[PDB]
UniProtKB/Swiss-Prot annotation:
GO terms for molecular function: lyase activity; ribonuclease T1 activity; RNA binding; RNA endonuclease activity. It comes from Aspergillus oryzae (strain ATCC 42149 / RIB 40) (Yellow koji mold). Keywords: Disulfide bond, Endonuclease, Hydrolase, Lyase, Nuclease, Signal. It is an enzyme of class 4 (lyase). This is Guanyl-specific ribonuclease T1. The active site is at 40, 58 (proton acceptor), 92 (proton donor). Its EC number is 4.6.1.24. Belongs to the ribonuclease N1/T1 family. It catalyses: [RNA] containing guanosine + H2O = an [RNA fragment]-3'-guanosine-3'-phosphate + a 5'-hydroxy-ribonucleotide-3'-[RNA fragment]. The chain holds residues 27 to 130 of 130 of the full protein. One of its GO terms (cellular component) is hyphal tip. Disulfide bonds join 2-10, 6-103.
Length: 104
């Protein structure tokens, strides 16, 4: 079993924690990477009922297990807050118009 399923990608909570650690460090340092400048604010247009408080930031989690370092972000993201708490794992897979669905 996979802790999170994003389309056909299977992530363990340890893949998620590693991705969240890297994105939070950059957020704390006020730094970005990639043409889309991650980690960036996540507006939550979808209305996900996250149990941790906004503001939210999104950061790519890669199906290869590597930490995002600039380069293609893929469709999957970890979402965290300023308290370094995980809000969720979401994906562009199966959505249109730059929207997201939640990884189950």
């Amino acid at each position: 079993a996979c802790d999170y399923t994003c389309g056909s990608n299977c992530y363990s909570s340890s893949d998620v924690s590693t991705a969240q650690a890297a994105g939070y460090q950059l957020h704390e340092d006020g730094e970005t990477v990639g043409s889309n400048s991650y980690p960036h604010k996540y507006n939550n247009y979808e209305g996900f009922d996250f149990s941790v408080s906004s503001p939210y930031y999104e950061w790519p989690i890669l199906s290869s297990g590597d930490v995002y370092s600039g380069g293609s972000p893929g469709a999957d993201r970890v979402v965290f807050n300023e308290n370094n708490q995980l809000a969720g794992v979401i994906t562009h897979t199966g959505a249109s118009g730059n929207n997201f669905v939640e990884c189950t």
